[PDB]
Write a protein that binds this ligand. Structure first.
Ligand SMILES: Nc1nc2c(ncn2[C@@H]2O[C@H](COP(=O)(O)OP(=O)(O)O)[C@@H](O)[C@H]2O)c(=O)[nH]1
Ligand SMILES: Nc1nc2c(ncn2[C@@H]2O[C@H](COP(=O)(O)OP(=O)(O)O)[C@@H](O)[C@H]2O)c(=O)[nH]1
Ligand SMILES: [Mg+2]
Ligand SMILES: [Mg+2]
Lengths: 167, 560, 574, 168
């Protein structure tokens, strides 16, 4: 097994905790609790090779002034998340990428763009092609529309982060 | 056949270590800790809250050291109108270029500008927040104030600070300082790696020293130069680095004497008594354990420092003409160059996370019970008023779910304000150099704190975060208090405007010589000239009299 | 170089295993809820209680002491009138102890027989115990005051236990009984949450390291729907929780425990009568404790559990008795075998797993259990050394004033001696005895050696609160002190404050003693029979006659007493 | 390393706990704490062979109604103790040894008779020859006068017990 520090980033209430719990505890519950700091971990296998994951579910980008720098330096894999219910969550993913590439000081940072909550096709304000365009904009990065309420693309996120850390 | 001995020693050390964890957890005696609490003056408080980014520069917004500036009064006159300001904030919010930081910027600038007239600020914040609330096309009432997509939120944080500061110095500050001091002290009780700052004792698995370091508490007889001598006693560990020992001597001095021995640590040297003569010990000498491209720092144990050993101190003006060592901590690449404790089982030390969690628990309870406590059977004024606003608005949007009320209250008050104060203690207290570890621990405590507000009974399992398990047993008692705390404010008497206007006016007048509106409005204007077409296209749609446009263009005629 | 691979892999799997283990230990310790707990406490009538305390030797024969004939046995009248003498009984208590043929059991015997004889007149019993205790003190040969009452070298000591019991019964049934039964029940319930080894009674949840089941065992709480038969097909549902590792009998015991806990009546007197059936294909097959499909390690067979039968959650399970269809569905109770502990095994039998037997890795369970039942422990403790209505039990106050006045009678200027006497007389010689024998106070209480161990632990914890020395517990100290090492000082404070409060309470004239002791005496004069007592004391009077006669003659004895002695002999003879 | 179970029996305040602590921590503190149930254990090299000992510290004979028979049943070695300042305690050992032999249902049981507090010769009551004759009377039993205070024959007790368990 191998240690894999990952970080989940996004605006307030974009389904970070949701995806995380859905990935580790398997179950999802429509509950309203703001995350502050939650270091998870889980034994999981990728590419026929078992390793030890270490998830960090982060907080809202501005619910409070926080340790925004520490986990960017120490983190290795990054999953940026927006919600397809509010547009601003998509408008707030740029500065994230910026601070990541700045603090880490390199263009080769294992990252994945995720438009979560893809189970709402009536409240959709952010197109999938939009997120794909932002994905290609970031030096051809990965883009996976997911949903913690339907187990869609959930595992693929962390598996892709690990794979990108590999190569 | 060479596995039997290896496993013999292995399982031996294992047994010894687990047993030792149990023993320490059982033999943990409380000996933590103050006098007066060094709070921050309201100015530096407000400023370091409004702009946490520009660290020192915030003091430029403090006029504690305007008729000539013809552009300030005009723009202020513009802001004075509700329509112009509403369309302003709204139009600015509707922009894709408008980054996240820009919202905090404009919010802080706006609060800083209108800090003199809290009545207008309160009113316009009510209106704008209700706009965010009832007319939000892309928002769920239970996810309100969660996603930072409005000026009204950061502005709400600011206002929270403004109105609750008095309560902070009243009953929440002292226990907070006590919890922080107790935390630091506790962590520092057990070994800390100089390179990673991972200590044995903590409240975070991430910040955990996962190595069995056989150490031993020592009472060191410290002597001071002035030659000259002065006895003292410092409790240091055998695994402590030279600079760690130094830090402990300095701490002991500044505590037992009330004034610090120095301002700089780099300008002090430590001598040890070999056999009569005193040999000055350095961070890394010749015979140091070097493993490849990394070298081991000198510990006390490296010089065989016995218990009750003699220690001398050297200042840069005493005998440090030639007797001075270089500071390794300043090295631009120190991590890569030197190592201390690290260069193999983690969960074996989860027990430590319990130990500390118990040592610093009474203080946690004091802080929490204070935060949702009622002095003289009365809740804070701002709390009652704002919650009255939330109740009235919830009654004004055809909602029949008390959950929405609770959720709004838990997304507006403790999340926006109390976490900002809990995780950021240096926004409250002076001279508190913030360490990342303590930030992690505070993140754990703040996390538990707001878990005490959850309406969802979530059973903790094996796949739950260690931070959740660390406070999970204590959570459900807090929940019942939080639930009952909320209902007391509901059952609190309605706030008369006679008390309201006075409460606002006293502080407004008591803070009219604190902040300068000049720099504030001058920095606020820059967003107007950036997105003018938007502001005008919205304002003209919101039925703007010729007065607003004439005044606006007059302001633009005075600014350019 | 080929061995390095196997070594590395081994240490790896082992390490990760230890990870899963310790992790599960912490998670468990943090996620342990308190779903413990009753109503009417099965108290014993004073006759049965007192009889069990005085004679816990021959438990069943003690019914011979529970009650015309007195007037018939004139010998008993003479002996009785003789016992009422202070000098005589003094010589009678000392002369016996003086002889080396007089053992400890003899001393307990004498003390209790004398208590039963003198159970009608408890006034005199109090006063004679006072002189017997002061003589064990003032004129004591081997007297190191802070070591008094510890060695059982006298009759007076066991007597003192008896008297404490007699006088404090009321206080037990009033203020201490409930939390004690609540604690016994708490522990019992708590240990039944986790696996127990059917052959060693070692369990996972426990307060004793000796009793700890430091065995690797994967278990999971199974909810079982229980059906009762009454013919072939008769069914009524019942919910019973067991474990995957529970042996058949253990399951039976659980469903019976539950049944009694829902109907207040045992479904069966003997547990052997019940057999348990299982549904796999819609049909019910009786499961037996050991079958032809049971592994054997050397020469010992392994007991069949529920995981052995692949029992899943929500499984239906039938209960049969001996009058339903046991004409053919009868199994032989394995536990009945004489050498059942040698012929069978459950969860214990004497490379990764070789290092998974590490005892310390389970010590956290001791903590967990210690955490589980700590509320009841504190409740009991506080209710022992607490004072309802700001006053103390009559016997406690009175007796402590007696000790104080005794220290005054011997010129002692060390409060530590008074403390030591107080803690050697009452808690050691009484409270520990009720703590370690809850069956003395309750009925239908079957005490196990395991529960005996847990109660041992809590008792010792109780005793350290009466210590005078702040003991430095290190890596060398026993776990039973470690577990309660944090709660000790608070208890210590409460103890010193307790002795203070008792000392400062208003004194008691012998008028209250009169009405009280007369009330108890009149309450219990007819309950026991002084006949069997005196008749069983005569055996001791004539067996050491010359020594008692001598001891009495050396203390200026009247002709009356000795004439009465020889009269007693003549009456018992003729 | 095999596990040995050595049980320390005796009366009230003869020094069972004293001897056990002195053997375990090497410290003697003149205090007064009635033992109810204390379980010690320590790794010690016996006859050039590192074995794991487990010393059970019982209470006085009759301080409360107690579970005497359990540790007798499971115990592999026994160190009966008596204070030489009190003859009574020396008398009280007979029925104890009797119970040992009855429960073990044999006669070749690892056992040692220890007369503690042999440092108080001015306060001695029980002669050495008494205990010696008693040990001889108990089938050539092992006997030692010990002093946990003065560190006299403290380890040799448990040592000889271990050497007896492995004997015939
Ligand atoms: N329909 C749907 N709802 C979701 C999904 N993920 C999260 N949610 C809801 O969004 C709300 C807030 O999400 P949460 O994960 O708690 O926000 P965060 O902790 O800030 O990342 C929760 O109440 C969830 O019920 C999803 O994939 N589908
Ligand atoms: N002089 C002397 N005193 C002892 C010795 N062992 C024990 N004592 C004393 O006996 C007292 C009670 O001993 P303790 O260990 O509590 O007896 P236990 O009931 O067998 O545990 C203590 O206060 C000691 O001072 C010894 O070897 N020599
Ligand atoms: Mg979250
Ligand atoms: Mg003892």
């Amino acid at each position: 097994m191998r240690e894999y520090k990952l970080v989940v980033l996004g605006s307030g209430g974009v389904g970070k905790s949701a995806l995380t719990v859905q990935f580790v505890q398997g179950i999802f519950v429509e509950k309203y609790d703001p995350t502050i700091e939650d270091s998870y971990r889980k034994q999981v296998e990728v590419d026929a090779q078992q390793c030890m994951l270490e998830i960090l579910d982060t907080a809202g980008t501005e619910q409070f002034t926080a340790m925004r720098d520490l986990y960017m330096k120490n983190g290795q894999g990054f999953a940026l998340v927006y919600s397809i219910t509010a547009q601003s969550t998509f408008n707030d993913l740029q500065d994230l990428r910026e601070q990541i590439l700045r603090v880490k000081d390199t263009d080769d940072v294992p990252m994945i763009l995720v438009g979560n909550k893809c189970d709402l096709e009536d409240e959709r304000v952010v197109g999938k092609e939009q997120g794909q365009n932002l994905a290609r904009q970031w030096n051809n990065c990965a883009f996976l529309e997911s949903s913690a309420k339907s187990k869609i693309n959930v595992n693929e996120i962390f598996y892709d982060l690990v794979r990108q850390i590999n190569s | 056949k060479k596995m039997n001995d290896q496993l013999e020693l292995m399982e031996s050390n294992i047994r010894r270590d687990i047993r030792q964890g149990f023993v320490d957890l059982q033999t943990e005696k409380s000996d933590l800790i103050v006098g007066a609490i060094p709070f921050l003056d309201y100015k530096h408080f407000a400023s370091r809250i409004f702009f946490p980014e520009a660290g020192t520069l915030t003091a430029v917004m403090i006029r504690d050291i305007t008729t000539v500036d013809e552009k300030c009064l005009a723009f202020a006159e513009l802001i004075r109108d509700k329509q112009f300001l509403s369309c302003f904030v709204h139009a600015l919010e509707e922009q894709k270029n408008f980054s996240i930081k820009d919202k905090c910027t404009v919010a802080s600038l706006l609060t800083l500008a209108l800090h003199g007239d809290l009545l207008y600020l309160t009113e316009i914040m009510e209106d704008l927040l209700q706009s965010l609330m009832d007319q939000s096309s892309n928002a769920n009432p239970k996810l309100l104030l969660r996603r930072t997509e409005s000026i009204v939120e950061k502005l709400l944080t600011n206002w929270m600070s403004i109105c609750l500061y008095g309560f902070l110095r009243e009953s929440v500050g002292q226990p907070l300082f006590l919890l922080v001091s107790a935390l630091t002290q506790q962590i520092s009780k057990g070994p800390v790696d100089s390179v990673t700052e991972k200590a044995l004792y903590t409240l975070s698995e991430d910040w955990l020293l996962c190595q069995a370091q056989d150490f031993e508490p020592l009472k060191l007889k410290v002597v001071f130069a002035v030659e000259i001598s002065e006895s003292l006693e410092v409790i240091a560990l055998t695994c402590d680095t030279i600079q760690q020992v130094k830090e402990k001597i300095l701490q002991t001095f500044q505590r037992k004497f009330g004034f610090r021995y120095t301002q700089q640590i780099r300008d002090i040297e430590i001598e040890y008594e070999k056999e009569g003569k005193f040999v000055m010990l350095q961070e890394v000498d010749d015979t140091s354990e070097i493993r490849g491209h990394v070298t081991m720092l000198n510990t006390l144990k490296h010089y065989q420092v016995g218990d009750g050993a003699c220690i001398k101190v050297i200042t840069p003006k005493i005998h440090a003409p030639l007797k001075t060592q270089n500071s390794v901590k300043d090295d631009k690449n120190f991590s890569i160059k030197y190592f201390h404790l690290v260069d193999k089982i983690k969960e074996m030390y989860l027990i430590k996370l319990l130990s500390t969690k118990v040592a610093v628990h009474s203080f946690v309870e004091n802080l929490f019970k204070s935060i949702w406590g009622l002095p003289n059977n009365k809740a804070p004024l701002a709390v009652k008023y704002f919650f009255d606003f939330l109740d009235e608005q919830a009654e004004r949007k055809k909602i029949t779910d008390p959950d929405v009320l609770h959720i709004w209250k838990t997304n507006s008050l403790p999340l926006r304000f109390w976490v900002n104060i809990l995780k950021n203690p240096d926004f409250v207290f002076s001279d508190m150099e913030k360490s990342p570890h303590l930030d992690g621990c505070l993140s754990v405590i703040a996390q538990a704190f707001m878990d005490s507000f959850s309406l969802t009974d979530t059973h903790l399992d094996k796949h739950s975060p260690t931070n959740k398990l660390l406070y999970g047993k204590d959570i459900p008692q807090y929940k019942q208090e939080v639930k009952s705390y909320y209902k007391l404010v509901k059952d609190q008497t309605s706030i008369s405007s006679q008390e309201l206007k006075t409460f606002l006016q006293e502080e407004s007048k008591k803070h009219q010589n604190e902040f300068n509106e000049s720099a504030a409005l001058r920095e606020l204007y820059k967003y107007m000239q950036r997105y003018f077409t938007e502001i005008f296209q919205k304002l003209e749609q919101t039925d703007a009299p010729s007065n607003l446009k004439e005044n606006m263009h007059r302001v633009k005629e005075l600014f350019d």
